[PDB]
């Protein structure tokens, strides 16, 4: 069904975005070692 | 006085460490950017499917 | 030494500047993410409507 | 509302640009 | 010594390479920003289409 | 119109990847 697949597509979207936040977190965590 | 040399040598060692970390930071940031791209791409694909539906099952249906 | 000194200080300041830059870049990425997230909400709502009413009302 | 969500989307993307500019401003201080 | 002056030179180059890196990254952020903006415009268009010769037929 | 707009959307996303690769390429020098 189109409804299910679109719902699945939107869940893919949300997972990607959460992954982004994850990497932004890792990026800022690394900058905590930038102390010069 | 020979201390200034010691001071720059240490700052130099600090900067080198700072740099390596920054590299990891940028790489993690690029990954986040890639993730947002994939997410928008997925959304675009979803939007394209909603478009097809509107001009098909909602077009001929009228 | 007097040269490596200036150099070291200079690089230190360059690095401090790049940190702020990346911190700004990270904020931007987060905003685009938020934009795509909210757009996702609008998209599902459009999908719902194409059913909610469009389905039954046709 | 959909228009409401879209304006919020616009606001976010606008904030992204503001930050990109902030990033470029800091970056130019290097060298 | 002839190692510290070098270290700072090596750091100088790395810093230069990172500047270019961040510049390339910012252009990527803008590209995704533009992508999402264009997608939102497409969505708004779809919303209108539905209201137009649709919610009246 | 919408197809055109969607095509543009994807061109932008692809350019995003293009700059990401450039960015990582530049990093290939740091720390060697």
Swiss-Prot record, chain B:
Q: Which residues form a coiled coil?
A: 10-38
Q: How is it modified after translation?
A: The inactive precursor F0 is glycosylated and proteolytically cleaved into F1 and F2 to be functionally active. The cleavage is mediated by cellular proteases including host FURIN during the transport and maturation of the polypeptide.
**Which locations, inside or outside the cell, does it occupy?**
Virion membrane; Host cell membrane
In terms of domain of life, where is this protein from? Viruses
Q: What does the comment on domains in this protein's record state?
A: The 2 coiled coil regions form a stable six-helix bundle.
Q: What does this protein do?
A: Class I viral fusion protein. Under the current model, the protein has at least 3 conformational states: pre-fusion native state, pre-hairpin intermediate state, and post-fusion hairpin state. During viral and plasma cell membrane fusion, the heptad repeat (HR) regions assume a trimer-of-hairpins structure, positioning the fusion peptide in close proximity to the C-terminal region of the ectodomain. The formation of this structure appears to drive apposition and subsequent fusion of viral and plasma cell membranes.
Describe, as the record does, how this protein assembles with itself and its partners: Homotrimer; disulfide-linked F1-F2. Interacts with host LAMP1; LAMP2 and LAMP3; these interactions promote the cleavage of the viral fusion protein F.
Which family does the record assign?
Answer: Belongs to the paramyxoviruses fusion glycoprotein family.
- Per its record, how is this protein called by name? Fusion glycoprotein F0
Organism expressing this protein natively: Mumps virus genotype B (strain Miyahara vaccine)
| Top-level taxonomy | Viruses, Riboviria, Orthornavirae, Negarnaviricota, Haploviricotina
In the UniProt record, the gene name given for this protein reads F
- What is the covered span of the full protein? 124 to 180 of 538
């Amino acid at each position: 069904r189109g409804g299910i697949d679109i719902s699945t597509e939107l869940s893919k979207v949300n997972a990607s975005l959460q992954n982004t936040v994850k990497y932004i977190k890792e990026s800022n965590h690394q900058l905590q070692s930038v102390i010069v | 006085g020979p201390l200034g040399s010691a001071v720059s040598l240490v700052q130099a060692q600090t900067n080198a460490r700072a740099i390596a970390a920054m590299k990891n930071s940028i790489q993690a940031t690029n990954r986040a950017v890639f993730e947002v791209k994939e997410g928008t791409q997925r959304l675009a694909i979803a939007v394209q499917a909603i478009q097809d539906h509107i001009n098909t099952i909602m077009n001929t249906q009228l």
